[model samples]
Target: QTVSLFIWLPESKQKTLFISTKNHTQFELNNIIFDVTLSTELPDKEPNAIITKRTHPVGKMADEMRKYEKDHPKVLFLESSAIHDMMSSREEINALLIKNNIPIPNSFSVKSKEEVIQLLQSKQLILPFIVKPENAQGTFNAHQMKIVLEQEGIDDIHFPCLCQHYINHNNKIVKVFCIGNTLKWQTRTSLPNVHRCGIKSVDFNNQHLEDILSWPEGVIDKQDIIENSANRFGSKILEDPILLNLTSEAEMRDLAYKVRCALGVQLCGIDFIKENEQGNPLVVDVNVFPSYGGKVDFDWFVEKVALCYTE
Candidate 1:
């Protein structure tokens, strides 16, 4: 029999299936008002098991996992860092994933300011590449360009960052939540450059499987879904199957999962670009947190943590 462990988070939901709270204090509030046990507080480092979300440096958490296992018997560990790692920024980790032959986009992380300038000037660089700070969260100042050559010296746009290709064809964005090797839930939204952004949801399972099957995958049994969102963290939820089928859903999910495994990540959000090139879906960027929308609620996230927590 499986034992249920308390989740430690910073927020809560009153038993609503699709609800959420953003932080730990909110979890505390739900615990008090709604009797919800959030995954933010663990009791005294005891050898108890629970699905908890924790945030810390990726390398540090990876180091701590070994310690937790040795010091605490039967402590199944999943760090928040692991759940949120794009697993691309760290060259050591990414190189290992590449050795495993995961389907990842061609990415280059530049350190010196000179290299940053050189990349921008090159014409060989692909169109619609995403510009971001390597160490920052969210798309904050991240910009999308048909050509990055024009973005030179734009302030905070220089050095030690990621220049990723654009994904999400049809202008709509898709997000897939894989839990227990299954896509537990998904949401789709409208085109970002358009006014709708995320004001709708597109159901892809029924309409896009034929196209999805043609996409790349390392293995056969893993499950994934496509949901749409605006920007990295924008949301409203759009609905349309034609738009969802704009790319191969299966291949994108496979890419997302490969990135997850390569990074030793348990739960994470991977971004992709939608394009038509011989009937296959292609992925563009892998983000650690990939902007999370406010509409996705706390309880849903808590349940997500639970599903992947001890599996």
Candidate 2:
């Protein structure tokens, strides 16, 4: 019913191991090892490096690999277990940030509607704040972060979610993607700051969001929301004297490194938003093994994969 493929690229030789289901299709790339495997096909031999869809192993395939690694300790996973465990929970990530004194949005974790109401009454979280899942990993629907404007909006939520104070960034959000020590940022169009909080709601679903928003259809149209409006707001956010004076490039890099170290994850993306024009930037989100497929240089990623063996 399903097929798995695995490619092994050693420093001296390149080998492809494919575990197919129905048909065989051949594609080639330079110095890239693609591997697909069913749970049974997991090899007993240890790999110098494992390039998988996830650094953290999940499901039956992962169980087999873990058993194999117990017998053979020479194996190395692209993502560390500590990083995988830490990044798995948004609440845990926020706690880690808070422990390190990193600037983060005021947040509360709630398991039910009653807790949500209780938190709202106790905390200073104002109107138009964000509510998302406490644990978000490999779950598509979890990305549906909703902004609540009124008290009644809290009733629509399920349980075990986070309520975060919304950061008004003037319809712009910055995503800082990191690969090892390399970091790059790209601005994306976000829901404009709520002018007058009424009964309005924003789902941040693919229909109304762009740039970092995941399109369920898996097709990125060229003339989407962010691409069409990127030119209009260029370098203006970068030129703000308050923003420039508040944080330095080295400081940002240090913060990124601290996040990596805190999670034990080498590759991650940090999100930031400014509350106002003269406000300091706050780290809003940290994603592990982010979606860099078409967004980043594949060669650089490949190189990083190669270097992971030693570094």
Candidate 3:
């Protein structure tokens, strides 16, 4: 008997995905597995009429599933929206930290331009407060705004935004990846500005990175929520952090594993920042659909996902 496979699509794309699934097939390379299926379709070599397709937002669907899990624990659902929204709302994360007893920056979620200005003045926000959509990706939109408190300067920028207290860091930030309680990978990057990437790698020098920092520091800790986000080729410079004691090689990897279990998401990424000279780490954010950039060995990742999904 073919098991029921839940499918999603927009009304317009349903037909296309279904057709694609019909011609879909799986490929295995170098003992690694990957599969491509048409939308609204499932794996079936035999002709059958059981296939069905529905147009819907996959991410939104997942959010609902999160709620549904309140009543049903045996079922599984996939939604990307949870990750999208998780990344968007800094306030939500702050709440998560407070609930978990984790330290985080004082942050406020702005719903309008008016609120932003008031918060800046009242909070005495420093020059470089992190700014971007609550749930956005790609460093394209991420930026650091020098909030110059002024009476009339508020009319210039848009709102429903981010104005986070900047925590300058002395060392490069670490990204911990988790897969169902498995910290698979961890690395460091350089966040030169509140808006750019942080963590560069050297040949395992014991010299402190914070001593040389030229800008205010910020580290994004996400080990409690997402797994494996730093697959970008640009992030590989510091693929190993154990040599610096910023994180021992084993602890770095262990963090990745812990994150996978915390979010209960098969794949996710967590960002962390070190506080001052204490080397204390505070998680900054978690990502759901972190990034499936086909940058790594595709076959290896596909197999990992496939195994993770089926098993």
Candidate 4:
């Protein structure tokens, strides 16, 4: 018989999704208060701070803690730098998934606008790929994305972004949150298929085709829904018949287990989609310290986290 090593994140019927706690040194509080001042830095080379919206260099801080961890053994950190990788960058996460033979959408890294044009002209990568910053996590600009279609679509792109082949997953996606060994998955709407919307690859030289080639209204509606359900990390939960899944709970939990193992981080959130419901699981994004919303009770979350504590 299969062992029940995992469970689904509880869904509360009430509108109150989170429990707010104030400063207290009680058991649940567990110090309940730790403060630090972060120095914000200006961005260079990569997406500028004004663009990526990342004000501080958090990675530097993590590295600092790693030093303290060895230099001062008595000073303990709840999350050690060794396993505390946020895996926020899309390019890095893709490489990790690939190393494990985990399924992920076809992706390319682009630095210059001219290179993207070159890629298309040479037929290396196809049209309709989603453009996202390499640092596809945290900050407002990191989540900013553009769907490229036609030559003009490529024009509205930011540099040094990961060009991910946007797979049309029937306009639905699966969001999974993990706490140690247990995980919970919920369904949400996703970007609709371009083929279903009548968007196809066409040549600019073909006047007859080019004249008729305009983005369909179908695409316009789903284009707005693209990030709404999939990319926008914790907007809200999806509901009803649409809140069904093609990926199994077991597989999702298994996916989480392996992803964490690969990254060597015990807790994180993972988002994935299939080419279709019948298609195999393909990881879309993996985030460090992702939202635990609607998955487990604040108490249960604490219990799971507390399970890791030695201090």
Candidate 5:
């Protein structure tokens, strides 16, 4: 009637993890073993599964254990190191998405300001484009991303960066969260279209993008927040009949599914934005092991993990 599920993760998340375990227990999930390190001592106990963030240090240890034994406690939400690294790099994922014929913004990486200007001129990439770190895995800093309205926008950029044509969608975006086969969508705010920067370029400060691009925190009810926001933005874009047809549920699900397959990730978040007029959907970003804290039913997620182990 019960089972032992070990959780190796950050100490701060233990409270939320414990709540999920309790919720699962109500549905016949027995107990959860907690540890920062996935100690070797616990495996002989034959726990049903071990849950950990995909990038946790202990994940490497878990992989080492699997190398020796054919049978071991199932590790949930973990991908191979190779796959993880591949999906983590913005440049690599963009290449993979292009190879798969999945829609993504026109983008290329550059190591210096001169290279950025050369590629822009050669590729005819216009002003008001996007500039972001080639590797998005580290700190959440403002300079990590910015919208360059003019040539000067390319000046403050850190080296080894990725730049893309900023597709216009009236400042609306949809984030798709995937867990295994489960996919969910959240509509949020985004940067507005820039017809011209006028100035050479402008680099954005270190303010977090997610905060401004999403509904303000402390909103009593997020469902209402998302629904109202979607209607406001949705109506503006749906005004065009062609765009209405293009922004279909089937289209979104298909794109999200494709991203999941392309990245080989069971848990991830994919950001999509539509281009101007034509309303072409473009995958802007892909994140591994995203925060599902208040996003979904914790028990449901746990059930999915249990099946991965038991099946």
Candidate 6:
């Protein structure tokens, strides 16, 4: 039996989306209807999964889904309480993030230097840790990161500071994203192992979070050559833009939601690295994009969409 997934999106196209067990932005779907202009057409029949856009380009969507909330209670409305999945500030959300182990460089009250260090070790993290600005504003502030490994690492650590496990990911970013109670996985070339454990602070920056970034033609052509691609088909003709797939993996349920809520975004991306063949799901970066040829996994995500419908 084929499950039905209804999505309300403005960009109407027979786009291709995917989900994979390994690391590739990939999906498989039965019947996915990309409602016209999204506003003109709504999912008439109850869908196994449904999502809304915060774009508010169609804020009027707000007026309607409320009725669905009343009646269908079986559908997950991205704009309705279903999307309040779509809804922080850090520090303010500590109660949530700390519970999920997202990581804290700044905005965290260190109980004690020794205690924190001991806990880090208990968590199997290293003695010295990665460092960065306690709080960041622009990309400049955000990407400037360092490695500190001194006995007095705390002292050398600038106040309003940063601290994280010096993860040894082999120049690869195992990206994981969530939407509408669904999970997704992908991998991309991340920063080189440039920063090292120096006596004090160092300077290194990581940019280009290509989670859903459109690929340059040659690159797409290059990837297209790799016929060995798994999960989804990569054909030369279709060049079907990669769309996001809601996945069976919601193990990231609370954590992804925490980050999304923290960023105050709906349908966003929060990613990680495979720590030596899967360890802690440490988050490396966070972002949200619904641009041309973007990802929309919320629909592929789940019947949890249905499961939580009554909520």
Best model number under TM-score:
5
lDDT of 1 by residue, 1-311 (tens): 23334444333322322344533322222222222244444534453344433333345534554455466666554444344444434344445555778544455566765664575568444434445455533232233221132343233445566655444344445555444354432336423321112222111122122332332332122322233211332334555323545445566557667767766765455544454322443344344432243345656555555545535
User: Which of candidates 1 and 3 reaches a greater TM-score?
Assistant: 1
Ranking by lDDT: 5, 2, 4, 3, 6, 1
Q: For model 2, how does the per-residue alpha-carbon lDDT over 1-311 read when each residue is reduced to its tens digit? A: 21123322222111122221212223233444433322224454444544443323367645555565576566555454446556777788888888877877787777788877777787666766788887666556556677776777776775688788877665556667676777766555544555333554445642234423432221223344354345432222344322544445775688788877776666678877777633556888888766542334434455454444335
Candidate with the larger lDDT of 4 and 5? 5
Model 3 lDDT on a 0 to 1 scale: 0.44
**Cα RMSD for candidates in order:** 12.2, 9.4, 11.2, 11.1, 8.0, 12.0
Cα deviation of 157, candidate 6, in Å:
5.1
Off by over 4 Å in 1: 2-4, 12-39, 45-48, 55-73, 80-105, 120-124, 136-156, 166-168, 184-234, 240-243, 247-253, 276-279, 284-311
The whole-model lDDT of each prediction reads 0.43, 0.57, 0.44, 0.55, 0.59, 0.43
- Of models 3 and 4, which has the larger TM-score? 4
Q: Which stretches of candidate 2 lie over 4 Å from their true place?
A: 1-44, 55-58, 61-72, 206-248, 293-296, 307-309
By TM-score, the better pick of 1 and 2 is 2
The most accurate candidate by lDDT is: 5
Give the per-residue lDDT of model 3 (tens digit) for 1-311: 22222323343444322222233446654454444343433223322111121122245534444454444444343433454455445556555555655555556667777687677667665444554345334333333233322334345444656556556654356666543433444555544323323322111111223322222232223331122233321233464555556666565555545544444455566777765524656666665434332234333443454445544
Residue 214 of model 1 has an lDDT of: 36
Estimate candidate 2's RMSD in Å. Answer: 9.4
How far out, in Å, is residue 228 in model 4?
Answer: 9.7
Error of 4 at 61 (Å): 6.7
lDDT of 6 by residue, 64-145 (tens): 6566678887654444543332221222333345666676332332434665466566764454466655443223554455
Deviation of model 2 at 60, angstroms: 3.9
Q: Give one digit per residue, the lDDT tens place, for model 4 in 1-311.
A: 11111111122311133353222112432433222111232211111001011222275544544554576555333334443444656777788788888888778888988988888888877767878787655456676666776656776577888887778786666788776676766776555466434443321211121222343555545545455434442334575222364766678878888898777665677888888665778888876655555433545554454443322
Worst 10 residues of 6 by lDDT: 233-242
Runs of candidate 3 exceeding 4 Å displacement:
1-75, 78-84, 117-127, 138-157, 186-188, 193-236, 249-264, 276-278, 292-294, 306-311
Q: What is residue 52's positional error in candidate 5, in angstroms?
A: 3.0
Q: What is the RMSD of candidate 1? A: 12.2
Compared with the true structure, the alpha-carbon lDDT of candidate 4 equals: 0.55
